[PDB]
Amino acid sequence: VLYVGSKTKEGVVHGVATVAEKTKEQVTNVGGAVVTGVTAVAQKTVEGAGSIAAATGFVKK
Amino acid sequence: VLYVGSKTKEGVVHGVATVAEKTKEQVTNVGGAVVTGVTAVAQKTVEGAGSIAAATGFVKK
Amino acid sequence: VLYVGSKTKEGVVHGVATVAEKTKEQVTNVGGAVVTGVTAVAQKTVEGAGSIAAATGFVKK
Amino acid sequence: VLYVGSKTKEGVVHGVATVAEKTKEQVTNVGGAVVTGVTAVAQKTVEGAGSIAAATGFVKK
Amino acid sequence: VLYVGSKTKEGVVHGVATVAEKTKEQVTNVGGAVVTGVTAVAQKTVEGAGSIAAATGFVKK
Amino acid sequence: VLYVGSKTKEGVVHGVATVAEKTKEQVTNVGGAVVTGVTAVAQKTVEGAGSIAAATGFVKK
Structure with missing residues (x-):
C-alpha cells in the first residue's frame, strides 16, 4: 500500500580502477x-533470466 | 497504492577508470x-531475459 | 502494507582496484x-535464474 | 667515446588509473x-635541484 | 669509453591503480x-638535490 | 672502459593497487x-641529497 x-x-x-x-x-x-574481459558491469532483471558472462558451446536438438 | x-x-x-x-x-x-572487452555496461529489463556478454556457439534444430 | x-x-x-x-x-x-576475466560485476534478478560467469560445454538433446 | x-x-x-x-x-x-593532489608526474633535471611537490611556509631573511 | x-x-x-x-x-x-596526496611520481636528478614531497615550516635567518 | x-x-x-x-x-x-599520503613514488639522484617524504618543522638561524 x-x-x-x-x-x-x-x-x-x-x-573501479583497472590497469x-x-x-x-x-x-x-x-x-x-569464448567470453573474455568483462569489467564493471551491472544490470537488474524483473521476471526474466539474467546472465552477465554466460558461454554455451552449442545447443543441438 | x-x-x-x-x-x-x-x-x-x-x-570507472581503465588503462x-x-x-x-x-x-x-x-x-x-567470441565476446571480448566489455567495460562499464549497465541495463535494466522488465519481463524479459537480460544478457550482457552472452556467447553461444550455435543452435542446431 | x-x-x-x-x-x-x-x-x-x-x-575495486586491479592491476x-x-x-x-x-x-x-x-x-x-570458456569464460575468463570477470571483474567488478553486480546484478539483481527477481523471479528468474541469475548467472554471472556460467560456462556449459554443450546441450545435446 | x-x-x-x-x-x-x-x-x-x-x-595509471585513478578514481x-x-x-x-x-x-x-x-x-x-599547501600542495595537494599531485598525480602521474615525471621529470628529469641535469645540474639543478629538482622538486616535485615541495612546500615551504616562508623564507624570512 | x-x-x-x-x-x-x-x-x-x-x-598503478588507485581508488x-x-x-x-x-x-x-x-x-x-602541508603536502598531501602525492601519487605515481617519478624523477631523476643529476648533480642536484632531488625532493618529491618535502615540507618545511619556515626558514628564518 | x-x-x-x-x-x-x-x-x-x-x-601497485590501492583502495x-x-x-x-x-x-x-x-x-x-605535515606530509601525508605518498604512494607509488620513485626517483634516482646522482651527487645530491634525495628525499621522498621529508618534513622539517622550521630552520631558525
Missing part, C-alpha cells in the same frame, strides 16, 4: 563460445 | 561466438 | 565454453 | 604553503 | 607547509 | 610541516 524506498541500490557498480599491461593476448575459438 | 521511490538506482555503473597497454591483441574465430 | 527501505544495497560492488601485468595470455577453445 | 643507450627510461610514469569519489574536499591556508 | 646501456630504467613508475572514496577531506594550515 | 648494463632497474615502482575508503580525513597544521 505504501513504499518509501529511498537511496536504494540494486545491481550497482561504482569506483592491464599485456604484451600479447590471444584467443582461438573453433565452434564454441 | 503509493510509491515514493527517491534516488533509487537499478543497473547503474559510474566512476590497457597491449602490444598485440588477436582473436581468431571459426564458426563459434 | 508499509515498506520504509532506506539506503538498502542488493547486488552492489564498489571500490594485471601479464606477458602472454592465451586461450584455446574447441567446441566448448 | 661511445654511448649506445637504447630504450632507456629516466623519470617516466605510465599506466576519487569525494563528497567534500576543503583546503584552508593562512600564510603558508 | 663504451656504454651499451639498454632497456635501463631509473626513476620509473608504471602500472579513494572519502566523504570529507579537510586541510587547515596556518603559517606552515 | 666497457659497461653493458642491460635491463637494469634503479628506483622503480610498478604493479582507501575513509569517511573523514582531517589535517591541522600550525607552523610546522
Whole structure:
C-alpha cells in the first residue's frame, strides 16, 4: 500500500580502477563460445533470466 | 497504492577508470561466438531475459 | 502494507582496484565454453535464474 | 667515446588509473604553503635541484 | 669509453591503480607547509638535490 | 672502459593497487610541516641529497 524506498541500490557498480599491461593476448575459438574481459558491469532483471558472462558451446536438438 | 521511490538506482555503473597497454591483441574465430572487452555496461529489463556478454556457439534444430 | 527501505544495497560492488601485468595470455577453445576475466560485476534478478560467469560445454538433446 | 643507450627510461610514469569519489574536499591556508593532489608526474633535471611537490611556509631573511 | 646501456630504467613508475572514496577531506594550515596526496611520481636528478614531497615550516635567518 | 648494463632497474615502482575508503580525513597544521599520503613514488639522484617524504618543522638561524 505504501513504499518509501529511498537511496536504494540494486545491481550497482561504482569506483573501479583497472590497469592491464599485456604484451600479447590471444584467443582461438573453433565452434564454441569464448567470453573474455568483462569489467564493471551491472544490470537488474524483473521476471526474466539474467546472465552477465554466460558461454554455451552449442545447443543441438 | 503509493510509491515514493527517491534516488533509487537499478543497473547503474559510474566512476570507472581503465588503462590497457597491449602490444598485440588477436582473436581468431571459426564458426563459434567470441565476446571480448566489455567495460562499464549497465541495463535494466522488465519481463524479459537480460544478457550482457552472452556467447553461444550455435543452435542446431 | 508499509515498506520504509532506506539506503538498502542488493547486488552492489564498489571500490575495486586491479592491476594485471601479464606477458602472454592465451586461450584455446574447441567446441566448448570458456569464460575468463570477470571483474567488478553486480546484478539483481527477481523471479528468474541469475548467472554471472556460467560456462556449459554443450546441450545435446 | 661511445654511448649506445637504447630504450632507456629516466623519470617516466605510465599506466595509471585513478578514481576519487569525494563528497567534500576543503583546503584552508593562512600564510603558508599547501600542495595537494599531485598525480602521474615525471621529470628529469641535469645540474639543478629538482622538486616535485615541495612546500615551504616562508623564507624570512 | 663504451656504454651499451639498454632497456635501463631509473626513476620509473608504471602500472598503478588507485581508488579513494572519502566523504570529507579537510586541510587547515596556518603559517606552515602541508603536502598531501602525492601519487605515481617519478624523477631523476643529476648533480642536484632531488625532493618529491618535502615540507618545511619556515626558514628564518 | 666497457659497461653493458642491460635491463637494469634503479628506483622503480610498478604493479601497485590501492583502495582507501575513509569517511573523514582531517589535517591541522600550525607552523610546522605535515606530509601525508605518498604512494607509488620513485626517483634516482646522482651527487645530491634525495628525499621522498621529508618534513622539517622550521630552520631558525
